[PDB]
Design a protein around this ligand. Sequence first.
Ligand SMILES: O=P([O-])(O)O
Length: 1095
Amino acid sequence: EELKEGIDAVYPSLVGTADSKAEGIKNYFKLSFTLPEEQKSRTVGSEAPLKDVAQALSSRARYELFTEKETANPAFNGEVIKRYKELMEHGEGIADILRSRLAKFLNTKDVGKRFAQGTEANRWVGGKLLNIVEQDGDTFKYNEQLLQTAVLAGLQWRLTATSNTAIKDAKDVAAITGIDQALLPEGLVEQFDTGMTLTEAVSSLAQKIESYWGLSRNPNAPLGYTKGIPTAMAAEILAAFVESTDVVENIVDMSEIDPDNKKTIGLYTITELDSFDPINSFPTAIEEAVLVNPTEKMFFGDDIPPVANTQLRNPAVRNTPEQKAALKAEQATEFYVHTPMVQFYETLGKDRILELMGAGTLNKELLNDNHAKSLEGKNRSVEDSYNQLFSVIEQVRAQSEDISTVPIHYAYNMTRVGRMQMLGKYNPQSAKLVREAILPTKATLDLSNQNNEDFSAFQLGLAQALDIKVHTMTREVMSDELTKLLEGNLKPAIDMMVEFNTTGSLPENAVDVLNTALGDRKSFVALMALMEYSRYLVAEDKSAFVTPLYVEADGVTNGPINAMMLMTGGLFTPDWIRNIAKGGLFIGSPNKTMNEHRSTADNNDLYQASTNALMESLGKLRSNYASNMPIQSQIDSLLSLMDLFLPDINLGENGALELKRGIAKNPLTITIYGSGARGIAGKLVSSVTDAIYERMSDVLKARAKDPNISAAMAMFGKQAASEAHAEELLARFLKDMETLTSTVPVKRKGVLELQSTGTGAKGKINPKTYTIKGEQLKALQENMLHFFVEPLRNGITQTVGESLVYSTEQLQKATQIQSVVLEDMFKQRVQEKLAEKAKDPTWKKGDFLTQKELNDIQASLNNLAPMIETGSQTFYIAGSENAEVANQVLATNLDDRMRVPMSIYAPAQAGVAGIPFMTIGTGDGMMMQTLSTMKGAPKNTLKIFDGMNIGLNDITDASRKANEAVYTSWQGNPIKNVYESYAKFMKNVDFSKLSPEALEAIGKSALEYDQRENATVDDIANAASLIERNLRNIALGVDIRHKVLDKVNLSIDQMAAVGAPYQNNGKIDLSNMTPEQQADELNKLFREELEARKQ
DNA sequence: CCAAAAGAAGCGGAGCTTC
Ligand SMILES: O=P([O-])(O)O
């Protein structure tokens, strides 16, 4: 334990004594950290890190010598060295600002003088930096090594933080602002997606600083300092970047939006460098020079990423051996630049790509204000995508004269729900633009004869890319549809691309040609198809055509189908057999493919079936109120309004109601993820208003093209057949909007009743500022909920099966109950330890617990089975990082601002997360994992969770293995896994130890709404034990269903497109049988097996 | 609705209070 002497020898002049017992000023930096047994950072021991790294970066020779490496990244050339020299000079500026802020802090309120006299200011939430200062005459100054190293981390963070940020969805934004996701104003999510909250910025910053300091945390040091000191430094650096304008701080006032919320939220945006800044070609020089084992870097050639030991943001969960194997397999895949697309992108240019794939140049006065904000969000995603791609290309180009020959590797990690996610924000897996320029797919085809198997594969790839639903028709039929398109509407674009793959030039109207030829088929992969077809046309040796064009073996209604196969636990029913066939599970039809099923057996997929069940359910609701004209009218107005702006809603001339599968796609999807009815109503309403806000921009653009244009023939001109026909459409719109915002349906004892809101909506509409706000959005929502979503949910349940719904409810209840106990017990164990610490003179409130004390508290929860094991995957549903456990500030900057709450890794309630976790995890998660590690695992693919991109040369075998992988995941039993964990929990849990708050939460999950109020600890305990039994029975059934189904002859083509189904070779033949007959035989096998168990 | 959480700032030196 000579560590004390060691760290003191490195920082012998820091203020205070490294002894938590000493009476005077104690130095918590020396108490909190220790030198690593093996060097982690090259700045440790350095007296002037900035000067030393600046010199290291001054020349390639000096760099190589500093990083003790014979060679250096070729991208580190002259122009780049020059940018870094300038950035280093800027680091001196940030350091100078930091030194002055400290000086100010020391002067104000005589803090420094008081600190010198013994006031323990180095323990205050805003004075932890005083732990890295040194006495200087009558004042104090930063230890230059710690300060400059932190500024270097600040520089690296400034360069690449933005590209490592997570994407914020509605849910996220709602959490931050506290505003109901359904009411989130327009563009709010965009403003918050392009920025970083305080927690977000400081957190990532503190991580970098601590890593660059290169020390290790002392397990017996208070988190208040081990985590607080690096965080305090980060807060000061963020403040310094605000002063230097490297970062813009924007305090968003929620009261301006929702006048009831008083939250004011800080948003931090890093100032972007010019897209053409040389530093973009090599933004990680500092990182790679400072750290022994750099984190941020590209992996070229044979430089492969290491394999992550723990699940993403879940340190407590280790990646299983099979998961690690999968990660290794995916990281070994070599990706390569497709020069043709890169050249095409570069020639079209950023502006035209935005015009073609974004919103082009939008002038804020020809567009609705809300619509505008949406278009701006669209442009951003594509633009950042474009710039990221070319910064990558700039670095690849330096690795060789032929960029198409430089192998690129990507790091991956397993997420909380078992998905193999490629690290980074804009990469082949996450960004469509990048996916068509950097591919792992490659094949050499013989396209000299259009009758070759190779040409057919090529056709399949082209058709799928061009939006031909290749999995719904046979290969032969798709071949004809593709030909028709290539020879017809696409011909003009094809000709242009031919010219491009000859002279390298594009017409001035390239965007119009493409846009016209593609229509709604437009996408980045569609551009790849046009490019690849045109390259083939001009190809010299069509006998050996090399192309990365791919075919995606794509899951058909994957999530829902997986849930149905994994969690249906009763006897087999004919409706289930017919419905599961829609997902590629064919019983008694050897070698049957999805292509044949859709063309000769059933043309309706699971979405269509849901939509059709919705129509039935909707019809029933109308009958129950057949006599109530007010209701009938409210329903007609809702349907009228949707048919007015949504493609999937058609109202026939004679009133015939038609709904297209599209309307059910997301609702079904998220309903399988545990979503509630209100959330679905909210999304449907948003898709309506978005169409409306856009139609307002269609109007503004109508008046500019002709001032004397009737509102009717300006808003519905293109959607009408005349001016009178447009007048009646406008009548509908105005009618519906007023009725749907002034009147809303209410649930009063099972019956629906209309009530005025008093907040009706009407008046001269201004196509410029038109907006449906709060109370009116709420009304549209209430109408959507009861007249459309309610029946939709009934339709969904009827389609996926009530048995599956029952299973998901028990799963949700079990995992929720368990998470409540984990959360509560953990907080109490913490509370007891703190009350125990308050009796310790060395300890101070604000200091928290040590990592060892936290590790102990977590270990003590093991008997409650916090982890769910499957044998190949581990799930920690309750796991999280929240501020509710410590409930205090960790640190602030020296201006008493940027107060970062102390977050701790600890269990928190699960809510409904148990459903997504287990369904995604044992479903598509396990399948991809299996696909990456199974015998003969397909090579050179790009896996995207529920679909996989395959090179045209291996489409048949890779897709058959994919279907085999699906079959393998269908042998899983997530309920059984939950059961095993829950049963251990039930035999060690003590409900009497739970706070009244926790015990009530449990009552909600385990008890009927009519038994909470007076529920005794012994009551809810017996109710919880009932769920264990429910789970055990569900799991037993699932286990039998899987065994029995495996005895029958099955053709599996869930990962459809190619027509290569996996055959399980079941011995029992169920061919020439109706679904009713098959269900009878399967149930016979079931009842038979049931006895085997009983005996 | 899962994928990662999540207010700011005076006064005083924590944590209550006001917007
Ligand atoms: O083109 P897909 O969606 O049928 O695979």
